[PDB]
Structure formats: C-alpha cells, structure tokens
Design a binder for this molecule. Structure first.
Ligand SMILES: [K+]
Ligand SMILES: [K+]
Length: 1338
RNA sequence: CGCAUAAAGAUGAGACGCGUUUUAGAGCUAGAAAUAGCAAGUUAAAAUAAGGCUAGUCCGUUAUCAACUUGAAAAAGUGGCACCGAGUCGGUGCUU
DNA sequence: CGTGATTCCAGCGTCTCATCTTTATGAT
DNA sequence: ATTGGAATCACG
C-alpha cells in the first residue's frame, strides 16, 4: 500500500516511464517468468522505456489509392471507347482489340500475330515509316480529308482519351489565336477605341518575351507595367493584363461599381460574374474583356505550342512533329560533327547505355537533364555547335515528344483535335457521326470533387447518393447521380459536430440564428450606466429588442456613441451615458442580415418570424455549395418568394465558415418549467440577464442536465478511437496510446493501486525539395537573377547560412549591401527575438547578417533605424513569400511598440508552463482514466494528480546538477528523463502547491509586477541549488505552511545519481507486424532469378520481369520435414519462413496448406510460432538479438556506461559550449584535462562490450586502430569522435559511422540460424512481465 | 472576451504529366564464328501494388498488435512483500 | 565453394476543391 | 535518411 508516483516522457519514437517513491527511489520487484525455461523469477527495477517505429501518416496511402482509382477509370475510358468501336472494328479487323490487349505478352504467349495494329509485318512497317510518331497520325487525321483506316482513327482517339491533359482551365480554348504581340496590339486598340482621354501606348515593347516570360506571373505584370509609360498595375489596363495572365484583379476600384466583381478567367463562374460586371457599367466594355480573354490563350498556348496554327487545325500535333523534325536534324548534325571531330567518343555517346549520352538518353535510364549535363562539355569542346548550344540553353535539344513538361497541356487541345478528327471522319463512318457526343463526353468527363467515389455502400470513403439504382456511365452521370445531395454530404461528412450535442450538426458561421445569438450575448453583457441610477444595472429584454430593431438592423457595426445618442439620448432622453463591461465597438454584428437586406431590398421578409427557417436554409445552401449550378438548383424551390433578379443576386453570394453551436442547442431545446429556449432566455432573461456561459452553467435550469444527458457516453469511443480524435501527428498519437497502455500496466504491477501523481512531458516534435520550391517562387516573384549566378544542389542548400543567404537574395538583411557567396562562415546568424526571450532556432526567427552589431541593442527587437532602412525590402520579401507574416511582424515590432517588460516576462513564463493543446489532451485522457470515482456533490475525486511539465525544466535540472545526457550512449536516457520528470514534478507540487493550477491538470483559483513574475519563474527551480548567483539556501528545503521535506540536498542528489547509474533499465522495442507495400515498386527487367515477383498471374518473371525485395510481415518458426536428395528423404528442420505482406492473408487463411506448398511437410500447427519484427532472443552471455526479418538480425543489448563517463563526454564535447561562466567553465575544463584517461577507459568499455555482445571483430579492430592512430588529436575532437563511436554498440539496426577520417561500415547479421537455438522472450509493453521460451527444446 | 490575418499540419475527394517493364517499329554489310564496320534511335499497346467479392467507374500500403486462458470480435482475466546491495540484476528474510 | 566482405539500391513531380485543429501574430 | 534485400566479389 506504499504511495508512489509515475513519470513519463513522450516522444514520436519512444515512451519513457519510471516509478518513484516518497524518497524518489525507483522500486525493484521480483517478477514471475513463464515458459519452459528453468528461470522462474527475475528482479527488475520499475524504470524503463518502450521503443517503436514512428507512426506513419495516411498521405502516401491516400495518394496510392487515388492513383489506383485513376488507373481504373482510365481503363474504363478505354473500354468505353472500344465498346463504341466494337461492331465496326469487328467488321474491319476481328482481332484488333484482342491484339491490343495482349500486346504485352511475348510471342510465345500471344494468341494472335505479334503486330497489334495491322497483324502483318508489311502493313506495320509501312505505318511506322509513314507515321513515326502517333502525333504524325493525329495531324494527318485532323488535316487530311481522305477516308482513313478505322484502326488508325481508333488509335488516335485512344491516344487522346488515355492521355487527355489537365482540366485546370475551364471554358473553351480556341487554338487559332497564338501570337502574343498581335493580340496585345488588338487589346491596346480596343482600349484606345473606348478610352480617348488617357489612351494606352505600348509601341516598342517586346510583348512576346515579356508576357510569355519564364518569371512569375506577378513579376511579369510588374515588368509590363514598368515598360508601360503612365500606366498603373491596379489600373484598368493593368487589371486587364492581370486577368489575362492569371492573377485575379479587383475591378471595383477601376469603375467605382461599389461591388468587387472579381474576374478570374480560369474560373468557370467568370462569365456569370462578367455579366454582373456588365450590369453595373455597360455592355461594350466586355469587348475589351473579350480581347483580354483571347490574350490569355495567347499566353498559355504560346508556352506549349510554339507552332503556326493557320496551316493546321491540330497545333499540338504540329508542335510534336516539329519537335520530331528538330530532333532528327540535330541528331544527324551531331553524329556528323562527332564523327568528324571526336570519333573516339562516338560509341560512348551513341552505343553505351550506361553513360548519360544519347544511347543512355534513349535506351538507358538517363533523363533530359542528365543527358544535357553529359553532352554540354562535348558541345562546348567542339566546332559548329553554336545552334546546338543555343537550343540546349533553351532546353530544346533532341527533345522527346512525351516528356515531363507536357503537364501544362490543357484538355481543350486534345478535345479540339478529337472533334476535328470526328468531323473529318463522320461522313465515311456513320457511327462516328452518331456517337460524336459520346466520344467527346468520354474525353471530357470528370467526376466532381464533391461527388467522390461511385460506390454502392461498400466503400468507407464514399458519400454519393444515386437517384436511380443503375450502373453509372459518363453519359448518364447527370441522371443517376444526385449531385446536390452528394455535394451536401461532401461538406457535411467532414464538418464538426458541436461539443455539447454530439448528435447534432453545427450551424453555418453566417447563419441568422448564430448572429442573433451572438448579438444577444453581447447585449446581455452590456452594463449601461446613466444619470439617475443608484446602482449599475443591465438592460432588460424590451430595451435589448428595441436596440436590436433600431441599431443592429440598420447599421453594420454599433459603437458606444451610437448607443448613447440614437437610443439613450433620442428615446430615453439621457445625455450622460457611460458603458461598463463592453468596449467601444461591439464585437458581434448583423452582417448576414445586412447582406440579405441589400440583396432582397425588403425588411418584412427578413423580420417575419414564421419564414426565418427559409432564410436559415438560404444561408446553408450558400455555405454548402461552391458551384453556382448546385445553388441554382437548390434555390429553384424558393423562386416564388423572390424575383429572377433576386435569384441572380443570391446565386453570386457565397458564405464560408461554420459555427460551433447547433440549432437544437440555440433554439431547439427548451427549459421544462419555463418552456423557453436559450435564445428565448437571451431575449428576456429578467433581472439576471445571464449570458450563454451562465445559461450552460445554471444548475436550476434544465439546459445543463440536457447537455450532460446528450453526451451520456461522453465521446462514446474506445481508448484508441478517442486518441484518434486528437489533432496532431499520427506518431504522437501512437506515443500517447503507448503511454496510456504502459500507465495501465504500471498500475497493474503495483497491486492495482493508482499512483499519487502522474507527471508527463512531451517533446517539441524532402526538406531540400521544399527549399528549392521556396527559392524558385521567391526569386521569380522578386525578379532577381541570383539563382542563375550559381546552380545550387538540393543537399548544398541544406546549409543554414547558405539557406539564409539565398532567402535574403544574398544581401545583408539589416543594411543596404550584398554578401558574398564565397565569404561563408564569416557572417553571423542572429535571432530576431533574443534566445533568452524566445528559444526559436527556425528560419522564420533567424537572419544572416554581415555583423550582428548592426542590429543595435541585443536586449530587445531590432532598432527603429534598421526598420526604417529596410522596411521596403522586408515587405518585398514578404510579397515573395521568402519571409512569412510572423517574421515580418517580428522585424517591424520596434515601430509598433517593440518589446515591453510584460511581454518578456510572459515569454519567460511560457517556457516552463506547458500550454500545448496536445499535452492538455494527454493530461485529460490520463485524468479521466485514473479518476473514475465521483464525489457526492458532482465533483471528481482527484486521487491521481496529472502534472504536465516542459522539457526546459528537466534540461535545466540536468545541466545545473551534473546530470548530463548523451543520446548516443544508449536508450537509457528516455527512462532517465522520465524519472527526472517525476522527481521535478513531485518536488514542485510539494514545495509549491499554489502552482497546481499552472501544472496539475484542472482549474484552481489559487493565484498570488513584471520583474516579480520574471524572477519568480526564473528562480522557481532555484530551491534545488545549494547557492544562488551570492545568496545561499538551506541544505533541506521546506514545504511551507505544513512542514514537509520537499528536498534534501545531502541525500536526494545521491539517490538521483544512484538511480541514473542503475545498469538494469527495461528497454523494450515494440514488436510490430510490418504492413505496407508488398515489395519495391520498381519493376525490374527480365532475368533468370528466383527472387523476382510476377506482376500478374500469367506474366512469368523470367520473360516479363517483376518486383523483388518483398517486405516480410512476420517470421514463422516451424519445425517440419523437408525432402532431401533424389529419393526425397524426410529431414527434420526447424527454420524461419518470413511470411511476406503479400502472402500474409494466404498464410493466415490456412497455415498448413501454405507451408505444404512452400515445401515443408508434417508441419505442427501448435508448434508454429509467430515472430513479428524486433522479436527478442537471448543466446549467451547476455547477448540479445532482435529479429529484423527472416534473414537479418539487429543488436539488442544496451551499454550501461557509468554516469561519470557520460558526464565527462558531455563536458569534453562542448554541447553548445559549456553554457557557463568562466569560473565553472574553467573548472570543467580542468576536470576534462585531469580526466583525459577516461577516454581510454571508455574505449576499453566499448571494446569489452563489443567482445561480449556485438561480436564485430573486424569493425572492432578497425575502430581500435583508428583510435590509436588519432591519439594525439585535441581532447574535444576525440570526445566528439568517441560519442560518434557508440553507433557500433547502439541497440537496433547496425549503421555505419565515422571516426575522424576513417569510416566504419555496418556489420549486418544476415544469419538467423543462431536464434533457432536461443531463448525467445515475449516482453510486455513495460517489459516487467516476460515469457521466455527455450526454442532449442522444440 | 471575442475578432482578423498568416503559417503549419491532419483528413478526404477530383484530375495531370512523367517513370519503369514486355512486345511492335523484319537493322545492313563483311564474316564460319568470336566479332568488326556502318545504319537507326523520338513512338505506341498493356500493367502500374499480386488481387478480393460485396461485382461497384468498389476495395487492397493509415491506424491497431508481448505470451497464456476465456472468447466472432471489441475485448475480459493471469504475475506477494520488505531489506541489503549492483555490469543489464543478484542475494537474504518473511510469505505462498 | 560455401562464406564473409563489399557494393548498390530503393517511384516522382504538378494542380483544383473541401473540412478540421494548432501556433503565432496582431486589433479592439 | 534508413535499413533490409539482392548481387557481386574476394578468398581461405
Ligand atoms: K501499421
Ligand atoms: K511487446
């Protein structure tokens, strides 16, 4: 019945747990051992850590599922096209589609001729010579008027449908207009035709180059405006240019229409809004817009076509043919020049696929960029390659037709080519004439994002509802699918239930009931004071209703002056009015009401009580649907109430956002006695004038009981389902779940006695490609040429100094100069907010400067002079997204207030008190699971106090009192951090009960200027220290009030050092059955290997290739009989099989038949043992091996290095220096100098451990030789290399490390034969309960 | 108190472009062959987790998972204490 | 001629839309 | 980046 406490450190890859007593001692208990081994009881300390792999997200799974859906839908598209052509093709070529379907098979497996298109070699060769590429055939079919073979027509249509281009552009793109300059001149002429007072003159400006430039859209607009004399970016011409290029312009200011009238041409609603804009100004202006529309295409098409469109109606096919012709010409010229200049390289360029030459560019794995990088030095070191070099710099040398950059092709181009082909060939083939709409729909059909998968209740990701129970095709999609209901469900399935009534859905944020609720909430909280009042009083119901009718329904916002004058002075005739409890401007307002009043021009319609649900439906319809058609079809049922103009005005209006309260709570539930709702009480509460919080905090009112009863099961979820509801990374959710499970197990271990306290801390927790994307966007938006100066690699940009240099355009960010790319390691990286105020080391709070002294004073924000100097550059960086809003706000804080003492004190406080929501959720879960007993008067009995700590407290405790931590030594540091968390939390809640509200989960009212808080929180951990800065403290600390020994410096520190020096710590790696992909996604070429996995049942890997490297879900220990020799005699073998992910379901269906098929016979089902990954085996001398897979092992022992060695390593390695004053820093340096021999000792330790467990003889000899080689190196470098050295003895998968210049590879244990005779250990989640099975006895 | 913005992240849906694999695009000449020289090279079909049944324009890489017993499953149950110590836990006394 | 040491290799870019939470800035 | 699969390679 001894009282104890639990300490926990939560991480994404570890959960450390510890049990402490009143003395802060870690108990040790004898735990029973199950199994067939002679061992029956083992002594174990109640401290350890659970290790597991990081919890993966579902992004990869979602992407692969979407890819599967896309592939299935593309195959169906092809099937639809074939079924359209089925009869006519069968009349023309019976087995053409069969040959297409079996084109993948080898000649042996084909049931028809090997030539798919024509079925004979002569016609196939003739076709391939006449049409070298599919685009030649497409252009021929588009342009030629002669009757063509149906097979070629189908091939062109299938090539268009299968690869149909993106749908990011809505509307119709006419390929006829391509010239940028011509359409720009047309737009200028139209503008001058309508505007004579200030005509636009753009003659002498290279429109093509500027408008089709490779810079950003914003920078293109800025360049054009700069080259336009007397024109503004926000002007009418500037807005037209922005619309044409793609940036959405606001057209209100240009015409003073008082309506935004935003027009984005890519958006489909543009036309409607365009018409709206016309109704505001006139009809002729659209002509200019019309020209602008054309200009838009003139940009986009010019990016992809770059070909004449007057000769042919298929500009894409013409562009691909031009690419093919240029490729042929350049290839011939390059071959001739190479033969005449550098013959010895010719093979390497044109025959060896291994290199990145033309042979590797066509036949090998080399890409266009790799081929260009390989061939540029050759072109430079040659004559007559000027045109080739020009094309290469333009990325237009030997280009393929199917390349990575074809993603910019809109679907309109392919649709136009398809329409042209169908028009050409409809006369000869009647079915093409009849089914032209069908093929166009097949090409153009796209499932709306709000419809989702077309399932029939067998999918967990589907929400669509079907009007009729019939199979869905692209031609009857609009008739079968209930688009409105599906669109509503798309929003409603992902939205939030209100926290009070989980069954009900929340109202839209712009719902009229929501706004009335907020306004009445604010009005009830109004404490008016005027002359003739003995006491301040709240407003009554009638007065509040009159104010709402007069003030809020006639004004968008209500201020105190309007309340005093228009209501108190006009009606109440009181000229003296002082308000209390509210600010000048009321937060709540009737915005939706005013918008509806403007739209419908009627007050009685809005104010009618009986029809307000119609308006609540209106706002819901406007919130739910984004496409205007859905809103139109939903509001067509309301056509009679409004007019056609009113409907057109309502259609454009769109609302966004959802509230936090449901309709049933606000106005559905009623008090039993009164018969009034929450809104009714808000309207007329009486003299009380209770607000919403007091409404849901009133015991007498039935609302509290109704709210409690609605969540009769609370969340109504299991532990796992409750944790899944938390917002955060999946890895941290996995850590939380493991934490809860280990807490339950620890409670079970201690005799079902709940701990007095549970202290918990939680940690704060490719990139290069993100950096490349960010720098590209920023430089393109800014318009700089810094990137072109030096091509920086993805790994090279990882340097923080270089990253800041590139993000700041190479300039010093505080002054007006430019830094040098080669003068690195000289500039300083300084934080905008001092590290004392805010410990942030991210890019958003770091700035590279030539000298930090230019920042001014380092005790505050950068000075006002720096802000005045570089505000323009900071804003320019912000507009380029090189710096974020937070960074810019921190930079310009000096002009807006700088940093006050209160803010600094708050920043100091918020580094000790945990204010993260995820930690609060963990504390709530633990408190709910550890406090199940209720006090009689509706109170929780807090038998277990849940305390939340921050890592800063434990880190300071470690640093100040020589309890140093090195993560490379072993995984004991997790358990040690958990124990230190427990000790610190228990001591803090012992000495300072008043801080429970800050630390213990729950709400407490015990609270007891800026400098007082600053030094109170700064010295909240100073009662552990013997001396302060030079005041001293007593050896034994006292609680105060009630006398308790919270800390004893003469005893407790020794106990802590003994605990941290304990060799036995329960380090358990969570065994997991591996799940994921079946094998590597890379399809391998055909080879005579048994390790290849067929991609289909009928595709033999020796003839078609396939995947390899399967992922083993779990191994299976099976003893059985195998056939040996020609006689196939039965030999007894006990072996691991390693059931893979692909074979897991087959094995679990029936293991006996699976093992019989694998080759093993007489398998024993009972003796079959399932071993997931990281299964623990003990062999001899304490050597432990974890089962990485069926044929690989991992190190499973830990090096219990003495605490003195860890402290010496931490002191000598200078972790961010020693972070101490010169006195103690010199003392620690002397400690290192006089304890230099510890290094040798540490090496000895490692060596002996390596000889006892690791058994890496070659690596151990190599590392010993390396250590002897660099014995004369400085102590700091030797200590750092020795810290790196511990990777050899680390627990887990072997990894390669580096000792100075020498590198040591990983010694992998690729044999699992030893563990077949070892002792398998099943460890519970804490490792205290173990089951040891001696496998040699099987 | 709330409100605005930004950033980050989670989840879900709809698309695009590649990549990879096999086949098709009779390679020619001198050769007995080994080969040597020369010619050509851009494209397409199919698959893109094996596959499953619920047969859908669906689902298949997330989360969960020591052992034993009771079980569709969710899950439920199973493991004395104190003291001395310490090379991954041992010893002693009490108890069962 | 098995067997330990050594080497190599691993699907990847883009866009549109919606909902949510959390952190960090401020206005008021 | 990582760590298991696969092939290659040196060799006693
Ligand atoms: K998993
Ligand atoms: K386990």
């Amino acid at each position: 019945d001894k009282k104890y406490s639990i300490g926990l450190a939560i991480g994404t890859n570890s959960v450390g747990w510890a049990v402490i007593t009143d003395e802060y001692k870690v108990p040790s208990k004898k735990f029973k051992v199950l199994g067939n081994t002679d061992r029956h009881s083992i002594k174990k300390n109640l401290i350890g850590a659970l290790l597991f792999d990081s919890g993966e997200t579902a992004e990869a799974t979602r992407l692969k599922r979407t890819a599967r859906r896309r592939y299935t839908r593309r195959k169906n598209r092809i099937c639809y096209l074939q079924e359209i052509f089925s009869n006519e093709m069968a009349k023309v070529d019976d087995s053409f589609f069969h040959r297409l379907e079996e084109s993948f098979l080898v000649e042996e497996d084909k049931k028809h001729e090997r030539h798919p298109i024509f079925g004979n070699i002569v016609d196939e060769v003739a076709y391939h010579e006449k049409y070298p590429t599919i685009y030649h055939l497409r252009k021929k079919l588009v342009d030629s008027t002669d009757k063509a073979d149906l097979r070629l027509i189908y091939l062109a249509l299938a090539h268009m449908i299968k690869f149909r281009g993106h749908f990011l552009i809505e509307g119709d793109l006419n390929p006829d207009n391509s010239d940028v300059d011509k359409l720009f001149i047309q737009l200028v002429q139209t503008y001058n035709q309508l505007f004579e007072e200030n005509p636009i003159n753009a003659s002498g400006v290279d429109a093509k180059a500027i408008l089709s430039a490779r810079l950003s859209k914003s920078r293109r607009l800025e360049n054009l405006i700069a080259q336009l004399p007397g024109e503004k970016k926000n002007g009418l011409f500037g807005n037209l240019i922005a619309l044409s290029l793609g940036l959405t312009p606001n057209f209100k200011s240009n015409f003073d229409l008082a309506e935004d009238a935003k027009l984005q041409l890519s958006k489909d609603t543009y036309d409607d809004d365009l018409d709206n804009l016309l109704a505001q100004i006139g009809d002729q202006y659209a002509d200019l817009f019309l020209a602008a529309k054309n200009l838009s295409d003139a940009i986009l098409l010019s990016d992809i076509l770059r070909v004449n469109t007057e000769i042919t109606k298929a500009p894409l096919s013409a562009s691909m043919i031009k690419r093919y012709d240029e490729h042929h010409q350049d290839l011939t010229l390059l071959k001739a020049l190479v033969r005449q200049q550098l013959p010895e390289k010719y093979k390497e360029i044109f025959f060896d696929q291994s290199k990145n030459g033309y042979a590797g560019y066509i036949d090998g794995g080399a890409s266009q960029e790799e081929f260009y990088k390989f061939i540029k030095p050759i072109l430079e070191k040659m004559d007559g390659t000027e045109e080739l070099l020009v094309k290469l710099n333009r990325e237009d040398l030997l280009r393929k037709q199917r390349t990575f950059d074809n993603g910019s092709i809109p679907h309109q181009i392919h649709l136009g080519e398809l329409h042209a082909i169908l028009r050409r060939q409809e006369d000869f083939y009647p079915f093409l004439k009849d089914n032209r709409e069908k093929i166009e729909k097949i090409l153009t059909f796209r499932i709306p994002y709000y419809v989702g998968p077309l399932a029939r209740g067998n999918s967990r990701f589907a929400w669509m509802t079907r009007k009729s129970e019939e199979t869905i095709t692209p031609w009857n999609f609009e008739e079968v699918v209930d688009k409105g209901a599906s669109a509503q469900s798309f929003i409603e399935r992902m939205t939030n239930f209100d926290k009070n009534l989980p069954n009900e859905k929340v109202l839209p944020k712009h719902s009229l009931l929501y706004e009335y609720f907020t306004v009445y909430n604010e009005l009830t909280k109004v404490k008016y004071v005027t002359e003739g009042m003995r006491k301040p009083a709240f407003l009554s119901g009638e007065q509040k209703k009159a104010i709402v009718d007069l003030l809020f329904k006639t004004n968008r916002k209500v201020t105190v002056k309007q309340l005093k004058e228009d209501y108190f002075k006009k009606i109440e005739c009181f000229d003296s009015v002082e308000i209390s409890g509210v600010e000048d401007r009321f937060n709540a307002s009737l915005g939706t009401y005013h918008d509806l009043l403007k739209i419908i021009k009627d007050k009685d319609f809005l104010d009618n009580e009986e029809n307000e649900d119609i308006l609540e439906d209106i706002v819901l319809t406007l919130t739910l649907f984004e496409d205007r058609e859905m809103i139109e079809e939903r509001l067509k049922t309301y056509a009679h109430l409004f007019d056609d103009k009113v409907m057109k005005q309502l259609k454009r209006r769109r609302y966004t956002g959802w509230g936090r309260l449901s309709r049933k709570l606000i106005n559905g539930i009623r008090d039993k006695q009164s018969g009034k709702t929450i809104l009714d009480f808000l309207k007329s509460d009486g003299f009380a004038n209770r607000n919403f919080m007091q409404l849901i905090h009133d015991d007498s009112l039935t609302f509290k009981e109704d709210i409690q009863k609605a969540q009769v099961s609370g969340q109504g979820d299991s532990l796992h389902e409750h944790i899944a509801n938390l917002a955060g990374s999946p890895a941290i959710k996995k850590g939380i779940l493991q934490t809860v499970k280990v807490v339950d197990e620890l409670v079970k271990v201690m005799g079902r006695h709940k701990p007095e306290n549970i202290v918990i801390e939680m940690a704060r927790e490719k990139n290069s490609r993100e950096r490349m994307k960010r720098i590209e966007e920023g430089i393109k938006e800014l318009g700089s040429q810094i990137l072109k100066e030096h091509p920086v690699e993805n790994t090279q940009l990882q340097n923080e100094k270089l990253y800041l240099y590139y993000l700041q355009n190479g300039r010093d960010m505080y002054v007006d100069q430019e830094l040098d790319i080669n003068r690195l390691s000289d500039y300083d990286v300084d934080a905008i907010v001092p590290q004392s105020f805010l410990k942030d080391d991210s890019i958003d709070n770091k700035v590279l400067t030539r000298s930090d002294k230019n920042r001014g004073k380092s005790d505050n924000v950068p000075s006002e002079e720096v802000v005045k100097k570089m505000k323009n550059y900071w804003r320019q960086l912000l507009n380029a997204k090189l710096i974020t809003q937070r960074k810019f706000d921190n930079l310009t804080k000096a002009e807006r207030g700088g940093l006050s003492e209160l803010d600094k004190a708050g920043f100091i406080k918020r580094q000790l008190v945990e204010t993260r929501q995820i930690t609060k959720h963990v504390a709530q879960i633990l408190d709910s699971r550890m406090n199940t007993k209720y006090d009689e008067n509706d109170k929780l009995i807090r038998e277990v106090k849940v305390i939340t700590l921050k890592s800063k407290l434990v880190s300071d405790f470690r640093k100040d009192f020589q309890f140093y931590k090195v993560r490379e030594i072993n995984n004991y540091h997790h358990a040690h951090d958990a124990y230190l968390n427990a000790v610190v939390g228990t001591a803090l809640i012992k000495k300072y009960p008043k801080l429970e509200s800050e630390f213990v989960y729950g709400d407490y009212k015990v609270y007891d200027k800026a400098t007082a808080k600053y030094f109170f929180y700064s010295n909240i951990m100073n009662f552990f220290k013997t001396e302060i800065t030079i005041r001293k403290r007593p050896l034994i600390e006292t609680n105060g009030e009630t006398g308790e020994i919270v800390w004893d410096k003469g005893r407790d520190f020794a106990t802590v050092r003994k605990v941290l020096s304990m060799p036995q710590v329960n380090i358990v790696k969570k065994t997991e059955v591996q799940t994921g992909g079946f094998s590597k996604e890379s399809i391998l070429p055909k080879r005579n290997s048994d390790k290849l996995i067929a991609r289909k049942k009928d595709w033999d890997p020796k003839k078609y290739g396939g995947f390899d490297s399967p992922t083993v879900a779990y191994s299976v220990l099976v003893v059985a009989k195998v056939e040996k020799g020609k006689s196939k005699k039965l030999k007894s073998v006990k072996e691991l099989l390693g059931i893979t992910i692909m074979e897991r379901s087959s094995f679990e269906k029936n293991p006996i038949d699976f093992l019989e098929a694998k080759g093993y016979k007489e398998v024993k089902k009972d003796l079959i043992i399932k071993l997931p990954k990281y299964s623990l085996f003990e062999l001899e001398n304490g050597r432990k091996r974890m089962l990485a897979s069926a044929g690989e092992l991992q190190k499973g022992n830990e090096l219990a290095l003495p605490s003195k060695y860890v402290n010496f390593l931490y002191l000598a390695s200078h972790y961010e220096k020693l972070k101490g004053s010169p006195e103690d820093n010199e003392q620690k340096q002397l400690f290192v100098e006089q304890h230099k021999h510890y290094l040798d000792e540490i090496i000895e330790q490692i060596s002996e451990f390596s000889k006892r467990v690791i058994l890496a003889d070659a690596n151990l000899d190599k590392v010993l030789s390396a250590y002897n080689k660099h014995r004369d190196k400085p102590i700091r470098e030797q200590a750092e290399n020795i810290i790196h050295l511990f990777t050899l003895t680390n627990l887990g998968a072997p990894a390669a490390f580096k000792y100075f210049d020498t590198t040591i590879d990983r010694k992998r244990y690729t044999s699992t034969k030893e563990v077949l005779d070892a002792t398998l250990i099943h460890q519970s989640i804490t490792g205290l309960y173990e089951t040891r099975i001696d496998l040699s006895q099987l």
